[PDB]
Design a protein around this nucleic acid. Structure first.
Ligand code: SF4
Length: 260
DNA sequence: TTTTTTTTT
């Protein structure tokens, strides 16, 4: 009678949350039900204000220096707000906007095909959200409705300090959101042309493989439509296929999972 | 709710 978002008290979701769902949807569900395993700010209007201030600083950096790291992304995807952080964004020598996702491994082994499908899906989500932000499909009203940010509340001295040191003078969280929308959509920010995953050995720094994700919008949209169907409560969570039963060996919830 | 990172007889 209650959806998983309501039962787990989740106002939105993380990008990796849907990536774990590609690994095993039921394992992601148990991770939210039983969490016992798995700038100074004590409020959510400031925490989102800091995220906005970083966006307003990384947009001009990317458009001049041509290389930024830790770029926040957010947006509503089939009824659920999705939040994430892109690791790297830079312009190639040819002029393409590339997304670099570095994945370090302790053992020099090639990544499993099951691991790469989870990783290919994660960066595709990053592009799915990024393309929507820079094209005007992510509005401040869309953010308020899902996060329940109170714009009437003033931002604390923690943020106004971090803002005046950056040269910008914030008055309200509302004025900050309107500049973020304008800067994202009116600064010639192109779509992401290349999605590149790289697997690196932690010690020897050996390249364990390079993945250039073949992005297909209709395929990506279809999967999150299916994945969000669980979170909104329109279907029951599903475990791994019988072929991937080796995942249940290293799963924390193997001794309570009735799928197994 | 500050997102994610990384798996493994
Ligand atoms: S035991 Fe297997 S099916 Fe059950 S949650 Fe873990 S990985 Fe998924």
């Amino acid at each position: 009678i209650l959806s998983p978002m309501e039962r787990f008290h989740l106002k939105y979701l993380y990008v990796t949350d849907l990536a774990t769902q590609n690994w095993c949807e039921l394992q992601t569900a148990y991770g939210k039900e039983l969490p016992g395993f798995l700038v100074p700010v004590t409020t959510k209007e400031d925490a989102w204000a800091i995220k906005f201030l970083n966006i307003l600083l990384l947009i001009p950096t990317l458009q001049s220096e041509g290389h930024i790291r830790e770029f926040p992304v957010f947006g509503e995807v089939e009824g659920v707000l999705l939040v994430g952080v892109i690791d790297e964004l830079h312009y190639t020598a040819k002029g393409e906007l590339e997304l670099a996702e570095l994945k370090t491994r302790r053992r020099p082994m090639l990544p499993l095909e099951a691991q790469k499908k989870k990783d290919c899906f994660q960066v595709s989500l990053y592009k799915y959200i990024f393309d929507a932000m820079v094209q005007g499909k992510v509005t401040p009203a869309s953010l308020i409705h899902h996060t329940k940010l109170c714009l009437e509340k003033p931002l604390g001295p923690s943020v106004l300090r971090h803002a005046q040191q950056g040269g910008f003078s914030v008055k309200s969280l509302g004025d900050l959101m309107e500049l973020v929308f304008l800067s994202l959509t009116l600064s010639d920010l192109p779509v992401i042309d290349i999605l590149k995953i790289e697997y690196i050995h932690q010690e020897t720094a050996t390249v364990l493989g390079t993945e250039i994700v073949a992005f297909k919008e209709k395929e990506v949209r279809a999967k999150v439509q299916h994945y969000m169907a669980y979170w909104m409560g329109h279907r029951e969570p599903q475990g791994v296929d019988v072929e991937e039963a080796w995942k249940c060996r290293t799963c924390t919830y193997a001794d309570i999972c009735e799928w197994r």
